[PDB]
Design an enzyme around this catalytic site. Structure first.
Site, PDB file in Angstrom:
ATOM      1  N   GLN A  19       0.687  -1.432   0.101  1.00 25.22           N
ATOM      2  CA  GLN A  19      -0.126  -0.075  -0.203  1.00 25.22           C
ATOM      3  C   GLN A  19       0.802   1.085   0.051  1.00 25.22           C
ATOM      4  OE1 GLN A  19      -2.167  -1.447   3.666  1.00 25.22           O
ATOM      5  NE2 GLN A  19      -2.168   0.756   3.971  1.00 25.22           N
ATOM      6  N   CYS A  25      -5.629   0.416   2.851  1.00 21.04           N
ATOM      7  CA  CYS A  25      -5.658  -0.995   3.444  1.00 21.04           C
ATOM      8  C   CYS A  25      -7.129  -1.590   2.959  1.00 21.04           C
ATOM      9  CB  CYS A  25      -5.515  -1.349   4.747  1.00 21.04           C
ATOM     10  SG  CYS A  25      -6.709  -0.145   5.759  1.00 21.04           S
ATOM     11  N   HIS A 162      -7.892  -1.848  10.263  1.00 21.76           N
ATOM     12  CA  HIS A 162      -7.091  -2.138   9.273  1.00 21.76           C
ATOM     13  C   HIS A 162      -8.205  -3.181   8.686  1.00 21.76           C
ATOM     14  CE1 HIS A 162      -3.937  -3.116   6.740  1.00 21.76           C
ATOM     15  NE2 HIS A 162      -3.462  -4.266   7.472  1.00 21.76           N
ATOM     16  N   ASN A 182      -1.551  -9.610   4.407  1.00 23.66           N
ATOM     17  CA  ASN A 182      -1.539  -8.388   4.537  1.00 23.66           C
ATOM     18  C   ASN A 182      -0.916  -7.699   3.091  1.00 23.66           C
ATOM     19  OD1 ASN A 182      -1.612  -5.988   6.265  1.00 23.66           O
ATOM     20  ND2 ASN A 182      -0.284  -6.609   7.740  1.00 23.66           N
TER      21      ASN A 182
END
Ligand SMILES: */C(=C\S(=O)(=O)c1ccccc1)[C@H](CCc1ccccc1)NC(=O)[C@H](CCCNC(=N)N)NC(=O)N1CCN(C)CC1
Length: 215
Positions: A19, A25, A162, A182
Protein backbone atom coordinates in the site's frame (compact mmCIF):
# COMPACT_ATOMS: atom_id res chain seq x y z
CA UNK A 1 -15.23 -28.32 7.78
CA UNK A 2 -11.76 -29.40 6.52
CA UNK A 3 -9.06 -29.57 9.16
CA UNK A 4 -6.94 -27.00 7.32
CA UNK A 5 -7.29 -24.86 4.20
CA UNK A 6 -4.65 -22.72 2.46
CA UNK A 7 -5.92 -20.98 -0.66
CA UNK A 8 -2.36 -19.95 -1.58
CA UNK A 9 -1.47 -23.59 -2.11
CA UNK A 10 -4.47 -23.83 -4.42
CA UNK A 11 -3.17 -21.03 -6.70
CA UNK A 12 -6.03 -18.68 -5.71
CA UNK A 13 -4.12 -15.75 -4.17
CA UNK A 14 -2.06 -13.14 -6.04
CA UNK A 15 1.27 -11.78 -4.79
CA UNK A 16 1.55 -9.72 -1.61
CA UNK A 17 1.25 -6.03 -2.41
CA UNK A 18 2.42 -2.74 -0.91
CA UNK A 19 0.00 0.00 0.00
CA UNK A 20 2.89 2.36 0.52
CA UNK A 21 2.45 5.48 2.59
CA UNK A 22 -1.31 5.51 2.15
CA UNK A 23 -4.18 4.24 4.34
CA UNK A 24 -5.70 2.28 1.45
CA UNK A 25 -5.66 -1.05 3.34
CA UNK A 26 -9.49 -1.25 2.87
CA UNK A 27 -9.03 -1.20 -0.94
CA UNK A 28 -6.30 -3.84 -0.81
CA UNK A 29 -8.53 -6.09 1.31
CA UNK A 30 -11.58 -5.68 -0.98
CA UNK A 31 -9.55 -6.12 -4.17
CA UNK A 32 -7.67 -9.17 -2.91
CA UNK A 33 -11.05 -10.76 -2.11
CA UNK A 34 -12.35 -9.99 -5.63
CA UNK A 35 -9.23 -11.42 -7.21
CA UNK A 36 -9.66 -14.68 -5.33
CA UNK A 37 -13.41 -14.92 -5.97
CA UNK A 38 -12.92 -14.30 -9.70
CA UNK A 39 -10.31 -17.11 -9.87
CA UNK A 40 -12.62 -19.44 -7.96
CA UNK A 41 -15.39 -18.87 -10.51
CA UNK A 42 -13.08 -20.56 -13.08
CA UNK A 43 -11.23 -17.50 -14.48
CA UNK A 44 -7.41 -16.91 -14.61
CA UNK A 45 -5.90 -15.34 -11.50
CA UNK A 46 -5.48 -11.66 -12.33
CA UNK A 47 -4.25 -8.60 -10.36
CA UNK A 48 -7.03 -6.05 -10.05
CA UNK A 49 -7.10 -2.31 -9.36
CA UNK A 50 -6.89 -0.93 -5.83
CA UNK A 51 -6.47 2.50 -7.46
CA UNK A 52 -9.95 2.28 -8.95
CA UNK A 53 -11.32 2.19 -5.44
CA UNK A 54 -8.95 4.70 -3.85
CA UNK A 55 -9.62 7.31 -6.57
CA UNK A 56 -13.22 6.63 -7.53
CA UNK A 57 -15.11 5.28 -4.52
CA UNK A 58 -16.33 8.44 -2.83
CA UNK A 59 -18.21 6.58 -0.10
CA UNK A 60 -14.74 5.86 1.25
CA UNK A 61 -11.82 8.16 2.06
CA UNK A 62 -8.91 7.17 -0.12
CA UNK A 63 -5.56 7.28 1.74
CA UNK A 64 -7.52 8.23 4.91
CA UNK A 65 -9.37 4.90 5.18
CA UNK A 66 -12.55 3.08 4.24
CA UNK A 67 -14.82 0.07 4.73
CA UNK A 68 -14.54 -3.04 2.55
CA UNK A 69 -18.35 -3.36 2.66
CA UNK A 70 -18.66 0.18 1.32
CA UNK A 71 -16.12 -0.75 -1.46
CA UNK A 72 -18.14 -3.82 -2.50
CA UNK A 73 -21.38 -1.78 -2.54
CA UNK A 74 -19.68 0.97 -4.63
CA UNK A 75 -18.46 -1.56 -7.18
CA UNK A 76 -21.97 -3.00 -7.61
CA UNK A 77 -24.12 0.12 -7.28
CA UNK A 78 -21.88 2.75 -8.84
CA UNK A 79 -19.63 0.76 -11.13
CA UNK A 80 -22.12 -1.85 -12.40
CA UNK A 81 -20.07 -4.68 -10.90
CA UNK A 82 -16.90 -3.83 -12.84
CA UNK A 83 -13.42 -4.09 -11.35
CA UNK A 84 -10.51 -2.92 -13.55
CA UNK A 85 -7.22 -4.74 -14.04
CA UNK A 86 -4.17 -3.53 -12.19
CA UNK A 87 -2.26 -3.25 -15.48
CA UNK A 88 -4.84 -0.88 -16.95
CA UNK A 89 -5.43 1.17 -13.78
CA UNK A 90 -2.14 0.84 -11.85
CA UNK A 91 -1.57 1.79 -8.25
CA UNK A 92 -0.38 5.34 -7.92
CA UNK A 93 -0.98 6.29 -4.29
CA UNK A 94 2.11 4.86 -2.57
CA UNK A 95 3.34 8.37 -1.63
CA UNK A 96 -0.01 9.32 -0.10
CA UNK A 97 -1.57 11.14 -3.01
CA UNK A 98 -4.36 9.54 -4.99
CA UNK A 99 -4.81 10.87 -8.52
CA UNK A 100 -8.28 12.00 -9.66
CA UNK A 101 -10.81 9.30 -10.68
CA UNK A 102 -10.65 8.31 -14.42
CA UNK A 103 -13.02 5.98 -16.38
CA UNK A 104 -11.84 5.87 -19.96
CA UNK A 105 -8.76 3.86 -20.73
CA UNK A 106 -9.26 1.09 -18.20
CA UNK A 107 -9.98 -2.55 -18.90
CA UNK A 108 -12.47 -4.58 -16.84
CA UNK A 109 -10.72 -7.58 -15.25
CA UNK A 110 -13.58 -9.03 -13.13
CA UNK A 111 -17.27 -8.55 -12.45
CA UNK A 112 -19.14 -9.00 -9.17
CA UNK A 113 -22.89 -9.11 -8.56
CA UNK A 114 -23.05 -8.34 -4.83
CA UNK A 115 -21.40 -9.15 -1.54
CA UNK A 116 -22.17 -11.14 1.58
CA UNK A 117 -21.60 -10.16 5.18
CA UNK A 118 -20.67 -13.24 7.17
CA UNK A 119 -21.76 -14.20 10.69
CA UNK A 120 -19.64 -12.89 13.59
CA UNK A 121 -18.57 -16.45 14.33
CA UNK A 122 -15.10 -17.88 13.61
CA UNK A 123 -16.27 -21.46 12.96
CA UNK A 124 -18.92 -20.27 10.50
CA UNK A 125 -16.39 -18.02 8.75
CA UNK A 126 -13.93 -20.93 8.46
CA UNK A 127 -16.57 -23.24 7.05
CA UNK A 128 -17.64 -20.63 4.55
CA UNK A 129 -14.02 -19.99 3.53
CA UNK A 130 -13.32 -23.67 2.93
CA UNK A 131 -16.14 -23.88 0.35
CA UNK A 132 -16.24 -20.33 -1.00
CA UNK A 133 -12.71 -18.92 -0.67
CA UNK A 134 -10.81 -16.03 0.92
CA UNK A 135 -12.69 -13.54 3.04
CA UNK A 136 -12.10 -9.81 3.56
CA UNK A 137 -11.86 -8.95 7.26
CA UNK A 138 -11.42 -5.86 9.37
CA UNK A 139 -9.02 -6.19 12.26
CA UNK A 140 -7.28 -4.28 15.00
CA UNK A 141 -3.72 -4.34 13.64
CA UNK A 142 -2.32 -1.79 16.07
CA UNK A 143 -0.26 -4.49 17.78
CA UNK A 144 1.22 -5.81 14.51
CA UNK A 145 4.13 -3.39 14.26
CA UNK A 146 6.87 -5.73 15.41
CA UNK A 147 5.48 -9.01 14.15
CA UNK A 148 8.06 -11.12 12.41
CA UNK A 149 6.55 -14.59 12.62
CA UNK A 150 4.72 -17.19 14.72
CA UNK A 151 1.14 -17.50 15.81
CA UNK A 152 -0.09 -14.38 17.55
CA UNK A 153 -2.00 -15.14 20.77
CA UNK A 154 -2.40 -11.71 22.43
CA UNK A 155 -3.42 -9.45 19.61
CA UNK A 156 -4.71 -6.13 20.98
CA UNK A 157 -8.40 -6.42 20.12
CA UNK A 158 -9.97 -3.03 20.75
CA UNK A 159 -10.63 -0.97 17.62
CA UNK A 160 -11.05 -2.05 14.01
CA UNK A 161 -8.38 -0.12 12.16
CA UNK A 162 -7.17 -2.22 9.22
CA UNK A 163 -8.47 -4.43 6.42
CA UNK A 164 -6.77 -7.71 5.38
CA UNK A 165 -7.66 -11.02 3.70
CA UNK A 166 -8.25 -14.38 5.34
CA UNK A 167 -6.68 -16.97 3.04
CA UNK A 168 -6.82 -20.11 5.17
CA UNK A 169 -6.72 -21.69 8.59
CA UNK A 170 -5.32 -24.72 10.42
CA UNK A 171 -7.46 -26.37 13.14
CA UNK A 172 -4.99 -29.27 13.58
CA UNK A 173 -2.09 -27.21 14.85
CA UNK A 174 -1.20 -27.11 18.56
CA UNK A 175 -2.42 -23.55 18.50
CA UNK A 176 -5.11 -23.34 15.77
CA UNK A 177 -4.61 -20.33 13.54
CA UNK A 178 -5.88 -18.15 10.70
CA UNK A 179 -3.64 -17.30 7.76
CA UNK A 180 -3.89 -13.63 6.72
CA UNK A 181 -2.60 -11.78 3.68
CA UNK A 182 -1.40 -8.31 4.57
CA UNK A 183 -0.47 -5.44 2.19
CA UNK A 184 2.76 -4.23 3.77
CA UNK A 185 5.19 -5.96 1.36
CA UNK A 186 6.74 -9.43 1.67
CA UNK A 187 9.36 -7.97 4.05
CA UNK A 188 6.76 -7.79 6.82
CA UNK A 189 5.74 -10.89 8.75
CA UNK A 190 5.92 -14.30 7.19
CA UNK A 191 6.60 -13.29 3.59
CA UNK A 192 3.85 -10.71 3.92
CA UNK A 193 1.43 -12.94 5.83
CA UNK A 194 0.52 -13.22 9.50
CA UNK A 195 -0.88 -16.16 11.51
CA UNK A 196 -3.20 -15.16 14.35
CA UNK A 197 -4.69 -17.64 16.76
CA UNK A 198 -8.14 -18.92 15.79
CA UNK A 199 -11.01 -19.28 18.29
CA UNK A 200 -10.47 -16.25 20.52
CA UNK A 201 -11.54 -13.38 18.28
CA UNK A 202 -7.95 -12.26 17.92
CA UNK A 203 -7.75 -8.75 16.58
CA UNK A 204 -11.57 -8.70 16.37
CA UNK A 205 -11.23 -10.86 13.24
CA UNK A 206 -14.85 -12.09 13.37
CA UNK A 207 -16.51 -8.74 13.58
CA UNK A 208 -16.56 -7.48 9.97
CA UNK A 209 -16.04 -10.41 7.63
CA UNK A 210 -17.35 -10.25 4.08
CA UNK A 211 -16.90 -11.34 0.47
CA UNK A 212 -17.73 -10.30 -3.04
CA UNK A 213 -20.05 -12.58 -4.98
CA UNK A 214 -19.20 -13.53 -8.56
CA UNK A 215 -22.10 -14.65 -10.72
C1 LIG B 1 -5.55 1.11 6.60
C2 LIG B 1 -4.83 0.55 7.86
S1 LIG B 1 -3.07 0.75 7.81
O1 LIG B 1 -2.54 -0.25 6.87
O2 LIG B 1 -2.78 2.11 7.39
C3 LIG B 1 -2.47 0.53 9.42
C4 LIG B 1 -1.26 1.09 9.75
C5 LIG B 1 -0.78 0.92 11.06
C6 LIG B 1 -1.50 0.18 11.98
C7 LIG B 1 -2.72 -0.33 11.63
C8 LIG B 1 -3.20 -0.18 10.34
C9 LIG B 1 -6.57 2.27 6.95
C10 LIG B 1 -5.79 3.46 7.58
C11 LIG B 1 -6.67 4.73 7.45
C12 LIG B 1 -6.03 5.96 8.06
C13 LIG B 1 -6.66 6.54 9.15
C14 LIG B 1 -6.11 7.68 9.75
C15 LIG B 1 -4.97 8.23 9.22
C16 LIG B 1 -4.33 7.65 8.15
C17 LIG B 1 -4.87 6.52 7.52
N1 LIG B 1 -7.54 1.79 7.93
C18 LIG B 1 -8.82 1.54 7.63
O3 LIG B 1 -9.17 2.03 6.30
C19 LIG B 1 -10.03 1.27 8.33
C20 LIG B 1 -10.25 -0.20 7.92
C21 LIG B 1 -11.18 -0.88 8.96
C22 LIG B 1 -12.63 -0.87 8.47
N2 LIG B 1 -13.60 -1.24 9.50
C23 LIG B 1 -14.08 -0.40 10.41
N3 LIG B 1 -13.51 0.80 10.62
N4 LIG B 1 -15.12 -0.79 11.14
N5 LIG B 1 -11.10 2.09 8.21
C24 LIG B 1 -10.94 3.36 8.53
O4 LIG B 1 -9.85 3.78 8.91
N6 LIG B 1 -11.97 4.18 8.49
C25 LIG B 1 -13.30 3.66 8.23
C26 LIG B 1 -14.35 4.25 9.12
N7 LIG B 1 -14.22 5.71 9.08
C27 LIG B 1 -15.26 6.24 9.99
C28 LIG B 1 -12.92 6.06 9.68
C29 LIG B 1 -11.79 5.61 8.78
Amino acid sequence: APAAVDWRARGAVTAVKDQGQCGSCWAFSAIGNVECQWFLAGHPLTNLSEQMLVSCDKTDSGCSGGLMNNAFEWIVQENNGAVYTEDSYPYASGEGISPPCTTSGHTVGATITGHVELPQDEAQIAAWLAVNGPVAVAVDASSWMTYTGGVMTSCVSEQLDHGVLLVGYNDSAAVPYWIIKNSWTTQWGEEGYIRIAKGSNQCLVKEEASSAVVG
